[PDB]
Scaffold this active site. Structure first.
Site, mmCIF file in Angstrom:
data_model
loop_
_atom_site.group_PDB
_atom_site.id
_atom_site.type_symbol
_atom_site.label_atom_id
_atom_site.label_comp_id
_atom_site.label_asym_id
_atom_site.label_seq_id
_atom_site.Cartn_x
_atom_site.Cartn_y
_atom_site.Cartn_z
ATOM 1 N N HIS A 198 9.642 -3.011 -3.491
ATOM 2 C CA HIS A 198 8.865 -3.883 -2.617
ATOM 3 C C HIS A 198 9.736 -4.974 -1.984
ATOM 4 O O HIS A 198 9.335 -5.596 -1.004
ATOM 5 C CB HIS A 198 7.663 -4.507 -3.353
ATOM 6 C CG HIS A 198 7.879 -4.750 -4.825
ATOM 7 N ND1 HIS A 198 8.872 -5.577 -5.311
ATOM 8 C CD2 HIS A 198 7.198 -4.304 -5.914
ATOM 9 C CE1 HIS A 198 8.794 -5.630 -6.632
ATOM 10 N NE2 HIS A 198 7.790 -4.868 -7.023
ATOM 11 N N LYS A 254 -3.417 4.791 -3.254
ATOM 12 C CA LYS A 254 -4.032 4.048 -4.344
ATOM 13 C C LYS A 254 -5.178 3.142 -3.883
ATOM 14 O O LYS A 254 -6.202 3.034 -4.560
ATOM 15 C CB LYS A 254 -2.962 3.210 -5.040
ATOM 16 C CG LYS A 254 -3.464 2.367 -6.178
ATOM 17 C CD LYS A 254 -3.875 3.219 -7.350
ATOM 18 C CE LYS A 254 -4.037 2.349 -8.571
ATOM 19 N NZ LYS A 254 -2.776 1.602 -8.853
ATOM 20 N N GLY A 295 -1.888 -3.928 -3.284
ATOM 21 C CA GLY A 295 -3.142 -3.438 -2.760
ATOM 22 C C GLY A 295 -4.117 -3.165 -3.891
ATOM 23 O O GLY A 295 -5.323 -3.272 -3.706
ATOM 24 N N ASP A 296 -3.607 -2.826 -5.071
ATOM 25 C CA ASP A 296 -4.493 -2.538 -6.195
ATOM 26 C C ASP A 296 -4.863 -3.746 -7.059
ATOM 27 O O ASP A 296 -5.453 -3.578 -8.132
ATOM 28 C CB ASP A 296 -3.918 -1.430 -7.088
ATOM 29 C CG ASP A 296 -2.560 -1.779 -7.680
ATOM 30 O OD1 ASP A 296 -2.181 -2.972 -7.719
ATOM 31 O OD2 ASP A 296 -1.873 -0.840 -8.128
ATOM 32 N N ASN A 311 0.825 -1.208 0.000
ATOM 33 C CA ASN A 311 0.000 0.000 0.000
ATOM 34 C C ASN A 311 0.858 1.257 0.000
ATOM 35 O O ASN A 311 0.463 2.272 0.557
ATOM 36 C CB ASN A 311 -0.895 -0.012 1.249
ATOM 37 C CG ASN A 311 -1.853 1.171 1.319
ATOM 38 O OD1 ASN A 311 -2.144 1.681 2.411
ATOM 39 N ND2 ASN A 311 -2.364 1.595 0.177
ATOM 40 N N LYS A 348 -4.271 -0.226 -13.070
ATOM 41 C CA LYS A 348 -3.186 0.709 -13.327
ATOM 42 C C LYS A 348 -3.685 1.969 -14.019
ATOM 43 O O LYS A 348 -3.065 3.026 -13.912
ATOM 44 C CB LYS A 348 -2.105 0.032 -14.181
ATOM 45 C CG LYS A 348 -1.237 -0.979 -13.421
ATOM 46 C CD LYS A 348 -0.236 -0.271 -12.489
ATOM 47 C CE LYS A 348 0.597 -1.255 -11.661
ATOM 48 N NZ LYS A 348 -0.210 -1.968 -10.629
#
Length: 482
Positions: A185, A89, A214-215, A76, A374
């Site tokens: 990440h 996001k 998260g997305d 996130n 995205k």
């Protein structure tokens, strides 16, 4: 014992109170870059992976006990920048007033009441998403807010960008915050260990961690995966998808054979590992090969499953760190100034960890588990009736889609960002459950009760400005225009 340039970094990071685990990891990286590490992975150093098991072939679910020792974590740290947003996001609305975060939080809550009240839910934040995430949960999920610091948030580290010529901490008096940057990440492992959270989860009995963007709403807890890992005794599992023509630019999974010395502990050895290769790490000589989606037919979804105890142990055997291959990002201190000092930003990918475990594996999963949002175009599909909400709060395609999501292509310079996108759907979101493809060219505005079927193109002649589609308009296999 450091190069002074590495000493300046250490000093700089200690002054700003950067935890030691991060410093260690970053310094090893600094050393590698100091030796001229390329990151290069020529075709001659890897072999393709011809076959893997499939999530669709699996059927056994793990019992609710395994979930009691499971931690769900969502990346996130991202902002909706690429979409004209500066908020987190995951706080973007996806369906019927619910955001990405709402769905994961609700999925979690559902599992806690029907399967395991001990299922842990974590969020990896950055300095940019922390505050907004906290106040969101405070208002909508008090049960997560109450324990936000103690068990939900994992704060991603920030390392010093270094000058390309001297490898020393870059400086930008104009805006000192520009001197630091997230380390990819891959830093998830560093943060977990360094913050003391890894040790804490393991000692509390947690065994598995499922990490995903998260997305990426298609990344949910699948009991079949946990059972498969318990059965095969897998310590790290990467979910992958078959690469299509559109993915021939993205990275892919690959096989590699190593021979490790090992002195005074365990004799020599020859192992076959699994790794990831991005375009960056591929030499133009093999770039054609890199795109041969029939040779390297799998790509990382970033949906990872890791056995926490093993992760802790391995990191401990490595001096409280995880030696992932460094990625040397080239940029200028101030992105907004091509004349600002050139620098290197050191980062790692969490998927690279697949090479860090002997019992590592990859499993082929359907495209539905890799549904990142995205662009606003991807958001339109989701908002539409093409996706429904299950009882356990998951977002899946409606049955009349047959596993095929509507292909949405929105004209940028108009809907590249929330700014314009919300306009397009201002008066309503057209029905796309029966729509194969919808393309929007020029400045357009959906009416209300609009229903699209087959292939539909909506283009504005020559920008007469504002082409508002009639209400109740039923566009089928057509090209609407004024």
């Amino acid at each position: 014992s450091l190069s002074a340039a590495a000493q300046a970094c250490v000093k700089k990071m200690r002054d700003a109170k950067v935890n030691e685990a991060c410093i260690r990891t970053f310094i090893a990286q600094h050393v590698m870059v100091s030796k001229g590490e390329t990151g290069s992975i020529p075709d001659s150093a890897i072999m393709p992976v011809d076959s893997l098991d499939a999530l669709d072939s699996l059927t056994i679910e793990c019992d609710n006990a395994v979930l009691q020792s499971t931690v769900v974590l969502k990346l996130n740290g991202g902002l909706g920048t690429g979409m004209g947003l500066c908020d987190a996001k995951t706080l973007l609305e996806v369906k019927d007033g619910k955001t990405f975060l709402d769905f994961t939080a609700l999925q979690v809550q559902y599992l806690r009441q029907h399967c395991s009240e001990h299922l842990r839910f974590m969020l990896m934040d950055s300095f940019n998403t922390s505050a907004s995430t906290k106040s969101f949960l405070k208002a909508r999920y008090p049960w997560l807010y109450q324990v936000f610091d103690s068990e939900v948030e994992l704060m991603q580290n920030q390392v010093p960008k270094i000058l390309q010529d001297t490898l020393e901490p870059a400086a930008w008096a104009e805006n000192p915050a520009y001197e630091w940057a997230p380390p990819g990440h891959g830093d998830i492992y560093t943060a977990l260990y360094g913050s003391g959270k890894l040790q804490e989860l393991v000692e509390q009995g947690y065994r598995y961690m499922f990490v995903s963007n998260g997305d990426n709403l298609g990344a949910t807890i699948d009991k079949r995966v946990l059972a498969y890992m318990e059965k095969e005794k897998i310590d790290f599992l990467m979910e992958v998808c078959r690469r299509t023509e559109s993915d021939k630019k993205g990275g892919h999974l690959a096989r590699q054979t190593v021979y490790v010395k090992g002195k005074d502990g365990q004799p020599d050895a020859e192992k076959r590992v699994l790794l990831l290769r991005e375009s960056a790490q591929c030499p133009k000589a093999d770039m054609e090969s890199f795109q041969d989606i029939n040779k390297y037919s799998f790509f990382n979804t970033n949906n990872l499953w890791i056995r926490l105890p093993v992760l802790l142990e391995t990191m401990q055997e490595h001096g409280g760190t995880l030696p992932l291959p460094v990625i040397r990002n080239e940029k200028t201190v101030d992105s907004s100034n091509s004349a600002s000092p050139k620098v290197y930003q050191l980062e790692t990918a969490m998927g690279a960890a697949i090479a860090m475990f002997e019992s590592a594996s990859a499993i082929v999963v359907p495209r539905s588990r890799f549904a990142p949002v995205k662009t606003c175009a991807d958001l339109l599909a989701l908002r539409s009736d093409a996706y429904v909400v299950t009882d356990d709060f998951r977002l899946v395609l409606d049955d009349r889609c047959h596993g095929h999501p509507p292909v949405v292509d929105l004209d940028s310079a108009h809907y590249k960002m929330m700014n314009g996108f919300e306009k397009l759907v201002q008066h309503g979101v057209p029905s796309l459950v029966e729509c194969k493809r919808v393309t929007v060219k020029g400045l357009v505005q959906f009416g209300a009760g609009n229903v699209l079927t087959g292939t539909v193109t909506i283009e504005n002649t020559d920008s007469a400005s504002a082409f508002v589609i009639p209400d109740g308009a039923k566009l089928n296999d057509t090209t609407a225009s004024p």
